[PDB]
Amino acid sequence: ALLRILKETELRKVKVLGSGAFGTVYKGIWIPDGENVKIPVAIKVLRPKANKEILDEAYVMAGVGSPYVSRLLGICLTSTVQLVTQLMPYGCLLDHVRENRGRLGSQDLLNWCMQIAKGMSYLEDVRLVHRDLAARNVLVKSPNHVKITDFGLVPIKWMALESILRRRFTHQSDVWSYGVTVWELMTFGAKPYDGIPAREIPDLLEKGERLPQPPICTIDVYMIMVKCWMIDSECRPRFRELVSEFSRMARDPQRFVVIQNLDSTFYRSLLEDDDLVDAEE
Numbered sequence: 001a002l003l004r005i006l007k008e009t010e011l012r013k014v015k016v017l018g019s020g021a022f023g024t025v026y027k028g029i030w031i032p033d034g035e036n037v038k039i040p041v042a043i044k045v046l047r048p049k050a051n052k053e054i055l056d057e058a059y060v061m062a063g064v065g066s067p068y069v070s071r072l073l074g075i076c077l078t079s080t081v082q083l084v085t086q087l088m089p090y091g092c093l094l095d096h097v098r099e100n101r102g103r104l105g106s107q108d109l110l111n112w113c114m115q116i117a118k119g120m121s122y123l124e125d126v127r128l129v130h131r132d133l134a135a136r137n138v139l140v141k142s143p144n145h146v147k148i149t150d151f152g153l154v155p156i157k158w159m160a161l162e163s164i165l166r167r168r169f170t171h172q173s174d175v176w177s178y179g180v181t182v183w184e185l186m187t188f189g190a191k192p193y194d195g196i197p198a199r200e201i202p203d204l205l206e207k208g209e210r211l212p213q214p215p216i217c218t219i220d221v222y223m224i225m226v227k228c229w230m231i232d233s234e235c236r237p238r239f240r241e242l243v244s245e246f247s248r249m250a251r252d253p254q255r256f257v258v259i260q261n262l263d264s265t266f267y268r269s270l271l272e273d274d275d276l277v278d279a280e281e
């Protein structure tokens with residue numbers, strides 16, 4: 001068990017991305033000492049017994065990160081906590097699927113759902129519950145390869161039922177979140193239970209009422225969303241299961257997803273004043 005402290009002198013040319021609820025997110029170049037490398041990084045800077053929680057959390061970030069999980073590099077401590085991670089060139093996935101509504105295909109779409117599921121399968125192994133899984137928290141490394149990030153806390157509409165009412169979070173409750181994430185992607189980035197306000201959700205989730213089958217979706221794919229949305233959380237599928245099935249579908253996707261017959265704003269924005277080799281040193 002150990003931890004890597006970055007001092008600001010290393011962290012160079014630093015510009016803002018966005019002010020999220022958990023805090024602010026910037027970008028910049030990282031020049032570790034002794035190492036001649038320059039590294040494009042993402043820096044998060046957040047905002048009594050919440051702080052002590054901030055240890056055991058990111059200490060779990062030691063170890064062998066999955067190809068599909070965003071891996072922490074280390075921390076800059078100023079008067080605030082800056083978490084530093086390698087920059088994903090294509091920004092966030094939701095934006096990506098939103099911006100790509102027209103061009104996208106089913107080959108791409110299942111390929112991801114496999115990946116996210118495989119990433120979640122890994123965190124499942126390393127005994128850390130995510131709590132906020134949503135399309136908003138999947139980043140795009142390349143048009144074919146994606147990473148899950150964040151895991152560290154008011155989004156009810158991605159939450160499980162027990163998570164709402166009892167405030168208990170297992171890996172099974174992360175599967176619900178996942179289901180909603182898949183729907184998100186099959187809807188080309190739709191907002192779940194739009195117009196239906198947050199108060200009523202638990203109330204009428206009990207009515208067994210759920211998100212409607214996405215247009216481009218087959219029953220074979222839709223069954224799995226509903227599988228995740230079982231109140232009886234034990235009757236939800238294990239992440240390993242999700243990966244296997246999503247692998248089946250990827251070997252004939254037009255049989256499972258029906259579309260017709262690829263750019264990023266964010267990536268385009270990077271092409272100025274500063275993106276290669278992964279750098280897991």
Ligand SMILES: CC(C)(O)CC(=O)NCCn1ccc2ncnc(Nc3ccc(Oc4cccc(C(F)(F)F)c4)c(Cl)c3)c21
Pocket residue numbers: 017018019020024025042043044061069070071072073083084085086087088089090091092139148149150151152
């Ligand atoms: C527009 C907005 C409001 O800023 C939302 C927003 O986050 N937009 C996307 C920002 N973004 C774009 C490329 C990209 N590549 C990588 N990380 C990004 N963002 C990011 C998100 C969460 C972070 O914080 C955590 C917390 C917990 C765990 C980890 C870990 F390292 F394990 F993955 C990182 C950090 Cl450091 C960065 C990236």
